Amino acid sequence: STGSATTTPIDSLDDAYITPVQIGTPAQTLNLDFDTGSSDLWVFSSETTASEVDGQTIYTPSKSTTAKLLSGATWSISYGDGSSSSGDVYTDTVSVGGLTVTGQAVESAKKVSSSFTEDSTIDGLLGLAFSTLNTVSPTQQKTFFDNAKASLDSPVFTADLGYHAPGTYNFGFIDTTAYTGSITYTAVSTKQGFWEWTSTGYAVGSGTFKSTSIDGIADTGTTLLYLPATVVSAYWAQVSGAKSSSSVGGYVFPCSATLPSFTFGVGSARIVIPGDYIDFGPISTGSSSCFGGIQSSAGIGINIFGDVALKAAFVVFNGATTPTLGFASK
Numbered sequence: 001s002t003g004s005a006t007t008t009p010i011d012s013l014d015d016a017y018i019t020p021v022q023i024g025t026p027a028q029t030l031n032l033d034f035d036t037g038s039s040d041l042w043v044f045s046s047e048t049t050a051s052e053v054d055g056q057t058i059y060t061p062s063k064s065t066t067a068k069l070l071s072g073a074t075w076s077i078s079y080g081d082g083s084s085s086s087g088d089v090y091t092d093t094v095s096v097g098g099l100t101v102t103g104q105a106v107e108s109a110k111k112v113s114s115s116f117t118e119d120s121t122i123d124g125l126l127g128l129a130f131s132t133l134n135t136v137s138p139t140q141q142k143t144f145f146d147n148a149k150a151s152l153d154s155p156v157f158t159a160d161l162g163y164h165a166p167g168t169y170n171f172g173f174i175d176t177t178a179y180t181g182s183i184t185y186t187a188v189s190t191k192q193g194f195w196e197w198t199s200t201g202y203a204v205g206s207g208t209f210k211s212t213s214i215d216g217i218a219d220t221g222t223t224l225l226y227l228p229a230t231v232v233s234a235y236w237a238q239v240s241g242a243k244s245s246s247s248v249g250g251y252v253f254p255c256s257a258t259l260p261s262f263t264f265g266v267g268s269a270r271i272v273i274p275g276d277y278i279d280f281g282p283i284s285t286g287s288s289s290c291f292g293g294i295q296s297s298a299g300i301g302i303n304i305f306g307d308v309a310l311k312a313a314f315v316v317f318n319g320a321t322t323p324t325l326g327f328a329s330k
């Protein structure tokens, strides 16, 4: 089998991407944030504290003839951005773009933190990291991809995120028309549960490529590109007026600037992020200071190849017996 679904930026900045997902019988369609940095499929629901729901679409398990409560199971997650959610668990039928998993764990939120409530466009998350990170207790649950993998034509999914435009998540096949050149594969460590790989270096604009190993994760659920302070300083030094702002919480730059591209290495291959992809707009409404799309990872403990980087590439999440990651230009 295969599945193919369109993913759409939630806003004019590409702060996140949503993909429609069918849950239950009859289908209830929720727009979920596919997150290769986590491993829980959780949804706003009829069980979510009413004051914490503000425009999201909810899953109502009582209206699904295939929903079964997973007895005694709870979940609770906290993300790198400080947000969190928690609740109980059902199994139900979940379909993404024609691909169906019966008995998928659907984690129904009883509580969500303020940033989730404040984002009316995201109805939940669909985790695509390794199932070892799944938070369901006392019986850990598998991700959608993990449940689907054996049935797929090939044990892979691909992320083709658009810049200010829709893109695609495919399960079970590589669309050879969706990229240019070849796909370069690179090794993955699963030891921390992430799609963790090592970039071979970087360049700023037309500058010299610096060969240097950068360990990080491929994370569709993080907006920006978080890299070591030395790398980020080298990038922003090329932008007149750019500075690191403690008040704002990262590098900012004059909105009148035209930004240089940023290249990252994948083995001997190179992915070029166009400068425009690094502009995240005014720091506050009407400001002429703009927030940068490349930020320091210094206070994180890990480098994160978020959407800023991944949207510049066609990315293969290869779930073969030894997982690997593939990148192509597009």
Ligand SMILES: c1cnc2c(c1)ccc1cccnc12
Pocket (backbone or CB within 6 Å): 013, 015, 223, 224, 248, 249, 280, 281, 282, 283, 284, 291
């Ligand atoms: C991800 C993270 N932080 C941001 C954005 C996206 C977009 C704009 C912005 C403006 C000020 C501070 N942070 C951000």
